[PDB]
Design a protein around this motif. Structure first.
Motif, PDB file in Angstrom:
ATOM      1  N   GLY A  41       0.808  -1.202   0.000  1.00  0.00           N
ATOM      2  CA  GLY A  41       0.000   0.000   0.000  1.00  0.00           C
ATOM      3  C   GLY A  41       0.844   1.256   0.000  1.00  0.00           C
ATOM      4  N   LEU A  42       1.960   1.238   0.735  1.00  0.00           N
ATOM      5  CA  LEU A  42       2.912   2.345   0.675  1.00  0.00           C
ATOM      6  C   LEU A  42       3.527   2.475  -0.713  1.00  0.00           C
ATOM      7  N   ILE A  43       3.839   1.336  -1.345  1.00  0.00           N
ATOM      8  CA  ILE A  43       4.424   1.353  -2.687  1.00  0.00           C
ATOM      9  C   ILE A  43       3.440   1.937  -3.697  1.00  0.00           C
ATOM     10  N   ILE A  44       2.194   1.453  -3.683  1.00  0.00           N
ATOM     11  CA  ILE A  44       1.192   1.997  -4.589  1.00  0.00           C
ATOM     12  C   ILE A  44       0.801   3.426  -4.217  1.00  0.00           C
ATOM     13  N   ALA A  45       1.012   3.839  -2.961  1.00  0.00           N
ATOM     14  CA  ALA A  45       0.749   5.219  -2.572  1.00  0.00           C
ATOM     15  C   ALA A  45       1.747   6.161  -3.217  1.00  0.00           C
ATOM     16  N   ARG A  46       3.037   5.817  -3.129  1.00  0.00           N
ATOM     17  CA  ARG A  46       4.069   6.600  -3.803  1.00  0.00           C
ATOM     18  C   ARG A  46       3.864   6.601  -5.312  1.00  0.00           C
ATOM     19  N   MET A  47       3.448   5.455  -5.869  1.00  0.00           N
ATOM     20  CA  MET A  47       3.245   5.330  -7.311  1.00  0.00           C
ATOM     21  C   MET A  47       2.123   6.240  -7.809  1.00  0.00           C
ATOM     22  N   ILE A  48       0.937   6.137  -7.200  1.00  0.00           N
ATOM     23  CA  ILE A  48      -0.208   6.923  -7.655  1.00  0.00           C
ATOM     24  C   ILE A  48      -0.024   8.405  -7.333  1.00  0.00           C
ATOM     25  N   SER A  49       0.612   8.731  -6.198  1.00  0.00           N
ATOM     26  CA  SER A  49       0.853  10.128  -5.847  1.00  0.00           C
ATOM     27  C   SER A  49       1.804  10.796  -6.832  1.00  0.00           C
ATOM     28  N   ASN A  50       2.921  10.131  -7.156  1.00  0.00           N
ATOM     29  CA  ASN A  50       3.838  10.702  -8.134  1.00  0.00           C
ATOM     30  C   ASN A  50       3.256  10.675  -9.541  1.00  0.00           C
ATOM     31  N   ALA A  51       2.339   9.747  -9.829  1.00  0.00           N
ATOM     32  CA  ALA A  51       1.704   9.717 -11.144  1.00  0.00           C
ATOM     33  C   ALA A  51       0.777  10.910 -11.343  1.00  0.00           C
ATOM     34  N   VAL A  52      -0.080  11.190 -10.357  1.00  0.00           N
ATOM     35  CA  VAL A  52      -0.982  12.334 -10.474  1.00  0.00           C
ATOM     36  C   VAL A  52      -0.210  13.647 -10.349  1.00  0.00           C
ATOM     37  N   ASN A  53       0.901  13.655  -9.599  1.00  0.00           N
ATOM     38  CA  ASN A  53       1.766  14.833  -9.562  1.00  0.00           C
ATOM     39  C   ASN A  53       2.419  15.071 -10.923  1.00  0.00           C
ATOM     40  N   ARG A  54       2.829  14.005 -11.613  1.00  0.00           N
ATOM     41  CA  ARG A  54       3.440  14.162 -12.928  1.00  0.00           C
ATOM     42  C   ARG A  54       2.408  14.557 -13.973  1.00  0.00           C
ATOM     43  N   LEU A  55       1.156  14.147 -13.778  1.00  0.00           N
ATOM     44  CA  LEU A  55       0.134  14.410 -14.785  1.00  0.00           C
ATOM     45  C   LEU A  55      -0.470  15.804 -14.631  1.00  0.00           C
ATOM     46  N   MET A  56      -0.771  16.216 -13.396  1.00  0.00           N
ATOM     47  CA  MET A  56      -1.583  17.414 -13.204  1.00  0.00           C
ATOM     48  C   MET A  56      -0.776  18.704 -13.314  1.00  0.00           C
ATOM     49  N   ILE A  57       0.508  18.695 -12.940  1.00  0.00           N
ATOM     50  CA  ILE A  57       1.287  19.930 -13.021  1.00  0.00           C
ATOM     51  C   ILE A  57       1.639  20.280 -14.459  1.00  0.00           C
ATOM     52  N   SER A  58       1.515  19.328 -15.381  1.00  0.00           N
ATOM     53  CA  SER A  58       1.786  19.563 -16.788  1.00  0.00           C
ATOM     54  C   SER A  58       0.527  19.792 -17.604  1.00  0.00           C
ATOM     55  N   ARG A  59      -0.592  19.183 -17.212  1.00  0.00           N
ATOM     56  CA  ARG A  59      -1.776  19.206 -18.069  1.00  0.00           C
ATOM     57  C   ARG A  59      -2.586  20.487 -17.895  1.00  0.00           C
ATOM     58  N   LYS A  60      -3.180  20.691 -16.715  1.00  0.00           N
ATOM     59  CA  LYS A  60      -4.179  21.748 -16.577  1.00  0.00           C
ATOM     60  C   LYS A  60      -3.825  22.836 -15.570  1.00  0.00           C
ATOM     61  N   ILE A  61      -3.638  22.508 -14.290  1.00  0.00           N
ATOM     62  CA  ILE A  61      -4.042  23.477 -13.272  1.00  0.00           C
ATOM     63  C   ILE A  61      -2.919  24.359 -12.746  1.00  0.00           C
ATOM     64  N   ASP A  62      -1.983  23.777 -11.998  1.00  0.00           N
ATOM     65  CA  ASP A  62      -1.127  24.571 -11.123  1.00  0.00           C
ATOM     66  C   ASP A  62      -0.074  23.669 -10.503  1.00  0.00           C
ATOM     67  N   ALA A  63       1.017  24.287 -10.051  1.00  0.00           N
ATOM     68  CA  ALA A  63       2.037  23.557  -9.314  1.00  0.00           C
ATOM     69  C   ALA A  63       1.701  23.413  -7.837  1.00  0.00           C
ATOM     70  N   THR A  64       0.708  24.154  -7.343  1.00  0.00           N
ATOM     71  CA  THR A  64       0.372  24.188  -5.924  1.00  0.00           C
ATOM     72  C   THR A  64      -0.878  23.381  -5.592  1.00  0.00           C
ATOM     73  N   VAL A  65      -1.935  23.504  -6.398  1.00  0.00           N
ATOM     74  CA  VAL A  65      -3.156  22.736  -6.162  1.00  0.00           C
ATOM     75  C   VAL A  65      -2.923  21.261  -6.456  1.00  0.00           C
TER      76      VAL A  65
END
Lengths: 256, 256, 256, 256, 256, 256, 256
Positions: free
Chosen positions: C17-41
């Motif tokens: 669960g810790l492994i998949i937590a780091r995986m999904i967290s860094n995945a959405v961090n890599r996706l969202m800061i480039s696609r739409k919104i912001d570096a902070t939200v």
């Protein structure tokens, strides 16, 4: 394909939900404003039943896409507390505007003082009452601030009391001043004679004796009684040797 | 192996959830801003339905990894109160900005006083209104502070009242001062003659008599009436022997 | 013995669960800061989805020790409101720091006044903006106090207004003072001539007449226009017989 | 008899719950303070997981006496909100003390002003930072008051600005004063010459002209530059005929 | 008849619930005050487990009269939030009194200043600390006000700083005053010589030059150093021609 | 017909619920006020158990009309939070009035100062304590304001300290004043000689030297010691040439 | 067609729900105002049971359109917290108006001071008490502000204390002033002789000695005792050579 054939039924159920929302909302609006309560509370219950049965048809709609009821009401409760904590201070004003018309601490066209600001109340709207001050400004006070503070209704009782404080010199005759300020307010015609007319020594100030003169008169001509007794005090004190004193000092010289 | 074969289906369901989120959000945005309400409330309901059906597809997604609904809605309710108590004062401003355009205690370009700060309102944005003061500063006031305080609209009624307080000496003739200050404001052209023009003795101060002069004039040329009556008072009082008094004292010597 | 053989499976499920937590967290961090919104939200939603699926694997883990779901979500809801009411004022600042970059009432390097304290904004961090005052101090203001108060942006409009108040004696000639203070600000080069240049009698004070002089100039050289008009007023008034008055008194002797 | 034979099993389950509570709490304390985060947040999560699995073994224990789960979690949720609303302001300080070390608006040994009180920060503890003032007092400020107010870090930028206000008499020569106060701060060695050195006429006061002198110097020797320029001003003004004026008056006699 | 035959069993179950409540409460009170934590937190957990298992035996009792569990826990949750919101400010003081003994910003018998009121701390009780002021009054401060404000511990560091401000006349010799005030504090025996001894020109006031003298001394004899340096200043300034000045004025006559 | 035949059973169940409510409420009131706790907390638990089993018989009653339990407890939880948020500040006073009798920061008949208002406490009622001031007014303070502020118990310690501040002229002999003010308080009989008797130079004021005289005496005759030492100071200073000074000035003439 | 045939049954069930709502509400209103409690609390419980069984018939009605109970109570709980947080400050006033009649800190027609504003209480309404001030204004104070502040009942105890502060000159005889102010208040007839009559030296002011005279008299004729002792003080001090002093000064000349 396999998904959209329920989405069309969901759109049909939500459009008939909008239709029945307008129907029931206008029905209770037509019934309640004529039968019992008010034109303002009934519109609030109209909006409440409208956005309630919108929520009911949303809960009935979102089961057709597989989403269960205990999740739809969880997301709707989250959104409901979101819009409710958006409308906390936007609805405290409505609940206070109900009480300001139901109990009426002021009517329209009545000089009040709603916590610092004083003026004639023009109207009590749904969320905020408009008053016009003495000097033509328009002050819009929200109803949450009126009902949570004092309401000094300057114009609900007909008789009100002036208070002159006349400072005279220390060497003047107290009997002469108490006779002159009596003979002024005994001959003034708008000062009510059946109430408490006091000309008594209020205090011994720093450089002057302060007499207090408190007379009662009707609330329409209170300011004219003030301006006509004060001018007559200024006239009858110069004609009698009483001297309004300057800020006296008692300088002791030491010519070092 | 045994785990990821449902994770790919969860990613497919969440990507079609993002697609349907954009679809339904832009659909209700296209429908509501044209049909009934507003350009601002409809974007709020667009964001609400968008992050609502994102939550619905998350609840539908996380059952595919074995996590039950009553735990997903518990964690989502915790996160929902987290983001909701993040956006308390960020949404009270939006709910107040709805009321500031729906009821309009001020329009754009109207000199107001929103609780201490006074200026011309430039625009009412979504969260905060911009006003430009008299001296060119730009003051951005959040809408939660406007609707929770008085709104002194200086420029919604056309007539407003000046108040000069003229201090003269004690030995001056009250009839002469009340005639000179009448003859000034009887010949001034922008002072409204059909309203209440008062030159009466306001108070007997410490070293001066205070006359009050309150005249009504149009709200455009209020300040020019002030600056042109005060200068004429200063001119006509020196030409008539009336003396504006200094802070008088009454020193008694004791040359010890 | 009978207990630990499920505890090892619980540790395996929590470490994946810790492994998949780091995986999904860094995945959405890599996706969202480039696609739409912001570096902070997007970092906020990364932390939210990270500590959400940590909670999901905890709920899945603690059923292996016999503890039921309705008790695990009760203890997790208690702990969730504990950490959420720990982070109320720690997240209101983040939600306000989103709005201070999304709507920008100030940019970096712009003289503002965020409710009493005035200075050049250096940067807007995640929780608190740093400003440098006029005198070199560094003031760190949290974002919950900026967005819940006025923002007096001193440097967003190019023209701003000075206000000199010149006190002269009562016996001076008002035409001479209104000519001298006009001839000063007619020859000053940075004072904007196409705007409102006023030299009019503001008030009749206690021991001095107060002229007001309000001139408009560019916001860069506002202070230099103040310091160069005031010095020229002091020069041209001594060369013309106009006298700046001391605090006058009017002592009446009584040599007792 | 019939009751206690389950109470002994409940005591065994609760004592092994205490044992596993100490085990898991010290395990996560040993893991988290070394791996990723912090010595302070990890102790908070240690206490959270400790009093979480204490609650889990209590829910598992109290079913052995017949009490159901939905009642145990109701009483535990009541007790949880009791201890949580006991620890609201006791945990806001911990959440703020995380941010005061993670973001560091001040380090240890740095002169700050945390909202009225100014001193050197000694240390940032878990709940409250200790500062020592200029005069040896020890002020313990809770972290909820630091992060919810301004932090005026007096000692993070190396250059800071003095501001002398020198009042001279009205009859003095402005060129002579602006030359003397320039020749003082041109020969002072710690005043930074590459920055803004101003000796300009600030205001025309009641009985004195106020010159402003604002010079920049390093933040270590700011006070010594103040005390050495002010003493030299007092020396060079007596040696040049410039007179610091007393509170002038303009008494007009009326020997009545 | 048909009802009371279960009411007797309910009374038996509630009286054995009271018995086991006293038993378990005194057991955990006997265990926790000796093993780990505290005499104050353990009594709080004793009351919590006591009124928790009272609630458990109430839920077990009220099923015998037909009332279901989901209604008993609803009425008990209502009563629980009633007693919990009764004890909000009654338990914030207990949670703060834990921190005032666990972290000790003051010990008993130590001169502090808990936000305006300054005195020697007598004792820290459960809900409120008693301090005795300098003048014999007894001030009982609740612990919620101590931990939510500054704690100025006047007596935790041994050295503290006096600050005399000596106003002398403008015509005095600054070298003579800086030599006399040095020769006073060089011969004073309790003033610490290894610390910062300053006699420098603080300000040029309205009618006096203000010298500042700041000397460090032990916190026991701080007030005696103040009273013995100030008296020696008054003695050595009269014996040297330095004159403490009266509030000077600069009256200009106009004998009109 | 088909409806009322269950309504009669609902009325019978609710009337026996009222009967058993009075029975159990008076039973626990008779038991608890005699056995353990208090006359005030036991009445609170009597009202709590009374309006709890009223709620239990309402939940049992409203199932007989077809309304389910999960809806009855929802409407009852709404009404419960309604009456609970009605009684927030009405029950904080009761919870504070428990602590004011349990811990007793003041007893009846003891001069206190409960945050600005000072008087003799008459009684501590259930919700609000009555005090009688020094001048016969009756001040009713709610218990939520007493326990959330300082309690300055003027009359719990027997010895208290006066503080005279005697201003003498600058030319007086400090040894003579320190001998006269010692010889006054050495011969005064109610001033405690075994405590700290200080006659030392407090400050060098603007026109007077301020001696401080602080003496300790019993709290009954504190005011008489003040009034008898101050009158003796006024007597012994005129008989010794020490002069209480007027507000001195130092006028410099400029006869222009 | 298929939908409306249940909507007619829903309308029949809701109209009989309105009928039974009026029936049960008027029944409990008829029962409770006569049996036990109050005319105000019983109307509150009437409204509570009325809008409770309206909610019960709504939950019974909306199941006939297919909407489930767990969704109807969710939408009704959202609407219930909406109307409850609308009526927070609208019901705190009702709960305080219960306590203001149940415990009576003031009766009707009794001069009080409800936190700054002082007047005769006219009546205590449901939400707000009306008082008439001394000068005829009508002040409507909400009950949430009365019960959350001090209530200074000026007219519940019969005896009250005046406090004259007589400033005399420094050269007057203290025995003569203490004999004259005794002989005034020994011959005054309404001053209570069996209570504390003090004429003692209160303070040595800047230019005057302040005697304090505190006498007790009945609360009806307190103001007349003030006005008749102060006038007699002014009469008997001029006839005895005692001089009320002006603001003395001690000017030292320096004719430069």
């Amino acid at each position: 394909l396999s998904y959209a054939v329920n989405i069309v039924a969901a759109l049909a159920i939500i459009i008939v939900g909008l239709i029945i929302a307008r129907m029931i909302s206008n029905a209770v609006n037509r019934l309640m404003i004529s039968r019992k309560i008010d034109a303002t509370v009934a519109d609030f219950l109209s909006a409440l039943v409208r956005y309630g049965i919108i929520a009911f048809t949303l809960i009935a709609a979102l089961g057709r896409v597989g989403v269960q009821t205990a999740s739809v009401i969880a997301v709707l409760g989250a959104a409901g507390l979101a819009v409710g904590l958006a409308l906390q201070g936007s609805l405290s004003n409505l609940a206070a505007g109900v009480l300001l018309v139901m109990f009426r601490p002021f009517r329209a066209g009545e000089y009040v003082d709603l916590g610092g600001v004083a003026g004639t109340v023009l109207s009590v709207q749904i969320f905020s009452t408009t008053m016009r001050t003495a000097d033509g400004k328009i002050i819009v006070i929200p109803n949450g601030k009126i009902i949570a503070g004092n309401i000094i209704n300057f114009s609900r009782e007909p008789v009100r009391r002036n208070e002159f404080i006349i400072g005279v010199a220390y060497d003047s005759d107290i009997d002469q001043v108490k006779q002159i300020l009596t003979n002024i307010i005994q001959s003034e015609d708008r000062i009510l004679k059946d109430r408490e007319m006091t000309v008594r020594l209020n205090e011994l100030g720093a450089s002057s004796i302060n007499f207090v003169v408190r007379v009662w008169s009707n609330s329409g001509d209170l300011q004219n009684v003030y301006w006509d007794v004060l001018e007559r005090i200024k006239r009858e004190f110069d004609a009698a040797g009483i001297s309004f004193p300057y800020p006296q000092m008692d300088v002791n010289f030491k010519r070092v």
